[PDB]
């Protein structure tokens, strides 16, 4: 298969340095031109850097020209990108891509690593439980006050998938994220099957397992 | 550079009907344009190249048309997987550019939502704040109304709301409403509502606690 693998995103300040790298396999990556595209939360694709088989040139759109880099090394295959001065409009996920042999689309693409350049601080969320109450039942976590995005959420180590909504966080004014992830299951359930949501916040290095259960009353 | 304009920024169409995207280049591109498609939390797929080819692995019910300035994605009888946003490219010449993107919602039938109300927890309140939480599950239309009452007054101002992209399953959508009060205010009220208005329920639905009561 086909794979690329985009890291290196984070939080950075305005005027700050970052250094986002691509790792290819299961094709022959110097035989391959390949691209930077990035995706401003909401917004649509821009392409950012081309970089050609060898190395040996390298194009850029305006908006970016004289800040950013594309380098390749094709004997470990990786694609790099350099970003300098950064400012906040940079904000986005950035997409490590392949160009399709003899055309120019974009015939694969990395997951994306996302890219914050803010003055923000980081600060990892608390985990509260949205109880199940008083047929089908609906409980949840809510996780609350963190900054940069994102944040990973699932339920029972990944063994509860069917009926769980992950909302996407929302900036409160406070300049920090919230969000909550909910689950519906059985009514009957609720006395014996134990339900954990698992949060991770990598940016500030916060895990955290919540147990959420019937309040007792 | 060359803009590409594509045309109804959201279209909804109901499943096994017809789907028409339109793309238009502001110079003569021929026909070197291609269509993306792309779910959300996801990367784009190339769907069509050479603006009518479909690429390799694409369902036959996507097809491409145009040549020119004038470019069309046809998806005949959509499904509800194909809910994305689906963006145009030209690479005719240097530099390549995308058009804007145009959303595709599957329009299923009109399903009430299901409302939970969740009490800010104990241990938050510790913390000087309360968080008051209100969801919707698995409704369609998208368009709804949530309304917080704390004794009779209802609250403006103080809360967010939060909705997930349409379910590729069941293309419905689910909804969150936080109202988020300081403990001292939490604890000088008691009886704290969300009403909700929505086309699939013959009037609206409150769901409702007390502060302090089971």
């Known amino acids: 298969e086909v794979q690329l693998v985009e890291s290196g995103g984070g939080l950075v300040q305005p005027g700050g340095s970052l250094r986002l790298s691509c790792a290819a396999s299961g094709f022959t990556f110097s035989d391959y031109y390949m691209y930077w595209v990035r995706q401003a939360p909401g917004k649509g694709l821009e392409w950012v850097a081309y970089?050609?088989?060898?190395?040996?040139?390298?194009y850029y759109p305006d908006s970016v020209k004289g800040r950013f880099t594309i380098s390749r090394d094709n004997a470990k295959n990786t694609l790099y990108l350099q970003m300098n001065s950064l400012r906040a409009e940079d904000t986005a996920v950035y997409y490590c891509?392949?160009?399709?042999?003899?055309?120019?689309?974009?015939?694969?693409w990395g997951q994306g690593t996302l890219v914050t350049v803010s003055s923000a601080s980081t600060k990892g969320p608390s985990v509260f439980p949205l109880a199940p109450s008083s047929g089908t039942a609906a409980l949840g976590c809510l996780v609350k006050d963190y900054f940069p995005e994102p944040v990973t959420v699932s339920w029972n180590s990944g063994a509860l998938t069917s009926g769980v909504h992950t909302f996407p966080a929302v900036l409160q004014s406070s300049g920090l994220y919230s969000l909550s992830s909910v689950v519906t299951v059985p009514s009957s359930s609720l006395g014996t099957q134990t339900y954990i949501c698992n949060v991770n916040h990598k940016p500030s290095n916060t895990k955290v397992d919540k147990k959420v259960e019937p309040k007792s009353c | 550079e060359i803009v590409m304009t594509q045309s109804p920024a959201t279209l909804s169409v109901s499943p096994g009907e017809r789907a028409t995207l339109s793309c238009k280049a502001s110079?003569?591109?021929?026909?070197?344009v291609a269509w993306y498609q792309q779910k959300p939390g996801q990367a784009p797929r190339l769907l069509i190249y050479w603006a009518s080819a479909r690429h390799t692995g694409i369902p036959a019910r996507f097809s491409g048309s145009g040549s020119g300035t004038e470019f069309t994605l046809t998806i005949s009888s959509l499904q509800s997987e194909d809910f994305a946003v689906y963006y145009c490219?030209?690479?005719?010449?240097?530099?390549?550019?995308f058009g804007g993107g145009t959303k595709v919602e599957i329009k299923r039938t009109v399903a009430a939502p299901s409302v939970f109300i969740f009490p800010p927890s104990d241990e938050q309140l510790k913390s000087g704040t309360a968080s008051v939480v209100c969801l919707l599950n698995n409704f369609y239309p998208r368009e709804a109304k949530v309304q917080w009452k704390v004794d009779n007054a209802l609250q403006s101002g103080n809360s967010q709301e939060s909705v997930t992209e349409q379910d590729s399953k069941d293309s419905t959508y689910s909804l969150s409403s936080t109202l988020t009060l300081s403990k001292a205010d939490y604890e000088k009220h008691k009886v704290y509502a969300c009403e909700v208005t929505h086309q699939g329920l013959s009037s609206p639905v409150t769901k409702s606690f007390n502060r302090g009561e089971c």
């Open positions: 970089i050609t088989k060898g190395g040996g040139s390298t």
């Open positions: 110079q003569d591109v021929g026909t070197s």
């Open positions: 490219q030209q690479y005719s010449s240097y530099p390549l550019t």
């Open positions: 891509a392949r160009q399709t042999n003899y055309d120019f689309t974009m015939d694969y």
